Design a protein around this ligand. Structure first.
Ligand SMILES: [Mg+2]
Ligand SMILES: [Mg+2]
Ligand SMILES: [Mg+2]
Ligand SMILES: [Mg+2]
Ligand SMILES: [Mg+2]
Ligand SMILES: [Mg+2]
Ligand SMILES: [Mg+2]
Ligand SMILES: [Mg+2]
Ligand SMILES: [Mg+2]
Ligand SMILES: [Mg+2]
Ligand SMILES: [Mg+2]
Ligand SMILES: [Mg+2]
Ligand SMILES: [Mg+2]
Ligand SMILES: [Mg+2]
Lengths: 184, 184, 184, 184, 184, 184, 184, 184, 184, 184
């Protein structure tokens, strides 16, 4: 019976879509954290939200690494921040050490501060597959906001981030992100 | 049980209303296509939409023709464009020939490009009922948009149009349109 | 169960459509018989047939009379010829006498030579409703042909005709015809 | 019981087949959209249609990319246009931006203007697998047409297209397409 | 079971048809009674009877009045004489007074001398609908005869008549009558 | 139970009988069509009809060919015309070509214009059985007429004909026909 | 239930008919193979096909031999080629030796290359029945084609042929062939 | 259940075929016995056997007699020798006397030495049917051999023979024989 | 129960095996068709057949391509000819065009002339996996023959072939084939 | 019911986490054994234990090899020491010989001295994938200790080790280890 409720309710709720592209970035040893869900700002457009809450029905992540000069490994971490208070998470909050071989931070994952959605490691070789890509599609959850604009202060619980970290600074990595959500 | 769902859900969704008036237009031999649902633009007002989708619960069409100089026939076609891509439909896409006696286009109706809601023909005579009117009330369906403003490029699948065509160019026809819709 | 067969089969058969217009004709005392289904000719187009048989799912007739000079009556007979052998039926085969008040021919209707679909009589007055129209929509049956082109010799059993007869020779009557058929 | 209907009906309907080959084309940054189902024209031959509707039982897509000069990525999008009105779709209607990393257009996919059948990305490296191919076989649906010939104006709802877009202009990509359909 | 008897028996009995036309008659104040079923005479033709009895399966009456000079009312009475003895009924036997506003004769209708099938009153105005018509189709009953020819002496119980009476002597009224009967 | 109805009804209906003889006719290459049921004319005699309809309970055909000079083949076609309009059918309407080896006309038999009752081919040899005969007895159906006399214009749907065609013009063929029918 | 499917489907499919005549041919010792189903060519006519497949509902074969000079035997073989690749079968593929007394080829019938429908042998004597004929009516099966025209290259699996072989070269044999098929 | 065994086993066993022709032989008064099954010799070909046993699934006999000079009777006896020891049976072992009117030998048929499959007598007259033929198809049984080659010494139990005997020495008779057998 | 039949019967039937090797062949642009099942000839050896039929229980295909000079693609088509008449199939009968990217021939596959068992495409790169191989194991069906020796004329329905076609003429491809069959 | 116990108990027990990283080590021919679980020392911190027992709910192993100078194979053995007495296991206790191709020691695995969790072999080529990695996640068991500090003497039954051994001494391998355990 609950299935009928989903059909009945979701047929009356617009499934807004937001598209994000981030191409041309270099590989990092210390690492970087990239905002994906923050592009959803306040407004009456299809790629915007009313209020500070949106339910993401599903979202897609696409990454692609390229090897330059030397063979290198690209690591991508797709996680969810359930305790954000208006800040872009650092790398040391997600990993025990700032190394691509590092494991997740024991303190933060015990608290369930972050939820890992998918961790991807790409090895791109000059003498082999110099280019390597992967696509991930997963369901989403509720996403809160602490503001209106697309600045870090607008992030809230349920924020969406991607962590990139590797063994070289010369390779180039590209990514894209799309989300399907309801704003009611 | 599904009836309770409708009551439960529709009691929590605002039923926005949009009113449209179009009076003083002359009768046409070649014909004209008039936008009705495009007046719904983006915004936070009661006669506006958020996003690019709205479900029309019901809508009403009112037409009225007047005979001037000579007796003439007013034909009104109330149809739905389910394949709009940002254009106001022409008359030859709806009729085999640009004549008030013409039948619907076989190619487009086979594809279900247009859905006919109600076709009305009014005969107004100088020696008789010089004035003649009719009111139509029907349920609505989902209406998409390809933009934000009230220009033709904003029209999308589910658009609402009215086709007017007659045997004279001197008569005057007036119309009105109201829609009750939910924007969630 | 037979309902499912109709859905299963008709979803795989193209519903070809043919549109016919005939406007500007004068009213007749002796009467005239007009071909409607003969425009369907052999070919691979949407308004054509392969072979010499087509099943008409439904068809529509639209007529409109206008009074000129004097008040006059327009009579329209929409019948089906189930015994055609390559000829356009005459008026005396359909009516006992060549008069708009005449009844159907007793000899031919006993044989079921013709099947009456709808008989329409319009009275158009100069001091009243100078113009009068009517629309008829009915299901169709099998239609055979005795040729390929759009000449009278191509007509066969199941042909579609309209008989027009009135009390004056000055009035003008217009008509249109559309058919939805399967050619398999 | 409905299974028997499929066997009973499909044993009496010819399964026409159409073969298409497109080889020697260069990789594109802005992208290109290729017609596949338009080669089916009107006629009485096995690779032709009668009317403007055909049901595609199944269809197959074959692609193959080759790396020249530099390593490059080939992206292939196999989609269905359900709202075509006589035009070859552009790339910006299918992607948010004209980039191989771009996501699908939020506005058009919300409307269900296009249906994605299969998206394929091939990475061809000079130091590795310089050549890479893939074969896709899927069931088909109804395909309408707006004309008779093999020009873009003949395309209609259900049209079949392939989008090719990459990160270089020197690589060469080849493709083939076959469809099995019934024309009744 | 009795339904099968009707099908079994009526499939073996010829359904003879008789057509009658009476056009160009003037409106009457005192009134006139017109013979309709008397045209059925003795013979071996399709519009004739053997003996003096026929069962009328169904019969149709068509009337049409026209206004001349002044606006006038046409009254038509379609009745059945169940006690005829070889005479054409008068108007005073059917109406209390020889006036178009008169009610049926109390003495004769108490006896069931006449059976009223349909009473029609047409108001034709020079400034409005100068012409007005009506068609009636009803089942029939047994019809006896007192002779062989088409004279009044041949009428018997079950005879069919029409009474015409109005408020002017200048208008023209026309009529037609057809009957479907079995002669076994 | 329906069997009792047949006994009950047929015991009260006279079974009229009509006898026809046609002897001394020569064999034909182009062929000839002979009227058999037309001898039933209007009247009160036992071999006549009242009206224009008769139900033939059963009918019998007898043919006999004789060889003269050279051996020859006699072909006899006993068919029923269900779409007659007052004409004696030609040979080209029944056969694709005017040859004794010809097959039935594809166009007319698709329409069911003619119903084949029995086709008989007799080969008569001078050195063998110079004479050869055959008798056929079949049930009948309803037979309509378009007139009263025994001319071709009196033929109607359900008419009865025999087609004779052979490979020589010197042989002599004889025939007879009897029908048992009810005229009620 | 499957019977209803046949009625439901076959009532919507035209039963095209093709008529073939072949008269005046001499008897053969070595034998000859005659094309019967190849006359069905591509087109939109009633005696034509769309595509390269047709289902033959039923087909009829008529043969007739005549004795000239000396008494001779006519042998007729009506077979089906289920493995045709664009060639008219030879006589040695159907018979072990080129003799009218020969049996079927063991190699080809083991493979089921040919399917025998009916084998007819006629003995025509000058001192007896100089002429002898036979008619065969059988159901049909699917018939494929490898082309469009009526040449041998157009023949495919399911082709229809007749083999004629006898003990003399002076006799004359005639034949005809008709087929009832659906082209959907 | 045993039916399934036949299908299961016979689908895995080759059905070898052997064709035999014997034409141009004269009619005999004393009679002659002809070998039919002996042509099956040892080898790996389709018309050969491995070992000395074969099961004949079915076999066919075709005979044809011709009258020369005087009218004569051809008698054909198709029998089976179940006790053969390497000899071609004589005529006196099959008939009480060497006469075409003779009955079967009482001594040998009591022992079931021979099994009669079909006895055919043809009367061919110069003034009538000078030629007469007959075809017989029957199931077969096990056939043993006493050798390898096609000589009489190779015959064994189950051998197949035909006895020909008549009242004249001038007529010519022809025959053919085919067998379908399994060699496992 | 039918499973026991398979065990019971197959335990008494020898499972003959045939081994085929074909190494050192160059890649082809136009393509080549290779005989695999023809090596089975007549005889009493384990790799031979008696008669002209064998049931292949299972068969195995092994292919291996090598890149020389330039990177190239090897395409292998493993199909079954069900309508062979003593010929090695050409490439144009299996493919619409003589290109490695070509699709299967629509005309021949509609007829089911060929049955595709497995299509394999190998891409061999000089900078990567210069060598690439694949092994296929499938069940078999009945295989007929039209001769005795290992020439093309000996091929029959059920023949086994492999089609090789590529984009270069310098690469070398090798293959092997083994079949397990019963000859009873 | 036991499932509820797990939920009830594990919700009250802290799931301590320990993170270990070991990067920059060279490949070994003789091999090396690395301590992973010994980093868990006594204390009140989250990455420490109270007592000498901890239950590991789950643990993760990550390895990554890199090829330098020459292509080489990295072998990783992830095992459990269930009989430790305060010593780091040697390589000869785990393998029959100190070779990367060696099998496990028969004597020690019979005793179940070591339990193999996962054995991974990575082949890294200079002309191909110079870098190769793998991630393993498995449940854990009880882990005892014989001390307090992170020296080898502190190891006890249930210890966790990784064995690395390869065919070269120039390659570099990196690893990480994380464990989730309860200390109650
Ligand atoms: Mg919201
Ligand atoms: Mg909305
Ligand atoms: Mg048709
Ligand atoms: Mg490489
Ligand atoms: Mg079609
Ligand atoms: Mg009567
Ligand atoms: Mg009379
Ligand atoms: Mg009658
Ligand atoms: Mg055509
Ligand atoms: Mg077809
Ligand atoms: Mg044997
Ligand atoms: Mg041998
Ligand atoms: Mg065999
Ligand atoms: Mg503890």
């Amino acid at each position: 019976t609950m299935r009928a409720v989903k059909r009945m309710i979701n047929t009356h709720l617009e499934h807004k879509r937001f598209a994000l592209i981030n191409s041309g970035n270099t590989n990092a040893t210390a690492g970087t954290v990239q905002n994906l869900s923050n592009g959803i700002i306040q407004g009456d457009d299809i790629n915007q939200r009313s209020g500070d809450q949106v339910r993401i029905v599903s979202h897609k992540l696409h990454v692609r690494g390229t090897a330059i000069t030397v063979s290198q490994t690209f690591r991508f971490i797709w996680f969810r921040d359930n305790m954000n208070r208006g800040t872009t998470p650092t790398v040391l909050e997600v990993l025990n050490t700032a190394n691509f071989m590092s494991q997740y931070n024991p303190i933060t994952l015990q608290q369930k501060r972050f939820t890992i959605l998918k961790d991807v490691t790409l090895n791109c070789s000059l003498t082999g597959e110099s280019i390597k890509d992967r696509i991930i599609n997963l369901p989403g959850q509720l996403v809160n906001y602490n503001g209106a604009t697309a600045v870090a202060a607008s992030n809230g619980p349920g924020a969406i981030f991607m962590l990139q970290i590797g063994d070289s600074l010369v390779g180039l990595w590209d990514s894209s992100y799309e989300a399907v959500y309801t704003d009611a």
